[PDB]
Amino acid sequence: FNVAHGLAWSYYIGYLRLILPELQARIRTYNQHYGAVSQRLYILLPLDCGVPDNLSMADPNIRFLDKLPQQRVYSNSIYELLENGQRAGTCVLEYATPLQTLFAMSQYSQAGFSREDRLEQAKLFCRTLEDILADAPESQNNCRLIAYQEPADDSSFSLSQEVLRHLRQEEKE
């Protein structure tokens, strides 16, 4: 019923608690061998549940650089963030794919998931996941949640500016 609660806990148990303790070392290995990539996994949480099929970012100010090397195969992508033509940040960035699952459940008649419940379940997914990570041992400062809703009147949104805002806070603290 609160489908988002189970999906947050599963995403933590079967993915984040397994990948996050080895992330710092794969990043630190990249920053020796292959401007430096920042230290955390940045997780994109579009509250509209819109995740591209190829997990590929439309925004040309978010430009693919490289895959992180391995420490179970994990494909995690490093992106450069551009601002008025300038390289302004570099980080490991990806979508919270369970939001895509909520979207897909909403389309299937047998799932009992109303289309108009997507925003509420996305917000519950985000809140549950933030509460888990607040008491999570494997999170030693190695992921950041980026939750966002684009404006209601089709007014322009910059995903790159959204990401950069979060990065610059981490430089400040």
When asked if residue 100 is in the footprint of ligand WWU (CB under 6 A), the reply is no
- Residues listed for the chain: 173
Give the binding-site size for its own copies (rule: CB under 8 A).
26
Q: Which does 119 bind (CB under 5 to 8 A by kind): ligand WWU, its own copies, none?
A: none
Nearest-5° Cα angle at 148, 61 to 157: 45
From the list 34-42, 73-81, 118-126, 132-140, the region that binds ligand WWU by CB under 6 A is 73-81
Give the binding-site size for ligand WWU (rule: CB under 6 A).
11
Dihedral-angle region of residue 121 (phi above 0 means left; psi in -120 to 50 means alpha; beta otherwise)? alpha
When asked if residue 24 is in the footprint of ligand WWU (CB under 6 A), the reply is no
Give the CA distances from residue 167 to residues 7, 26, 63, 109, in Å, rounded to whole numbers and listed in that order.
27, 19, 16, 40
Closest C-alpha to 93, from 20, 165, 10, 163: 163
56 is in an annotated binding site: no
- Least separation, in Å, of the C-beta of 2 and ligand WWU? 14
From the list 3-11, 33-41, 131-139, 148-156, the region that binds ligand WWU by CB under 6 A is 3-11
> Could you give the CA distance from residue 42 to residue 112 in angstroms, rounded to a whole number?
31
From the list 11-19, 45-53, 130-138, 163-171, the region that binds ligand WWU by CB under 6 A is 11-19
73 is in an annotated binding site: yes
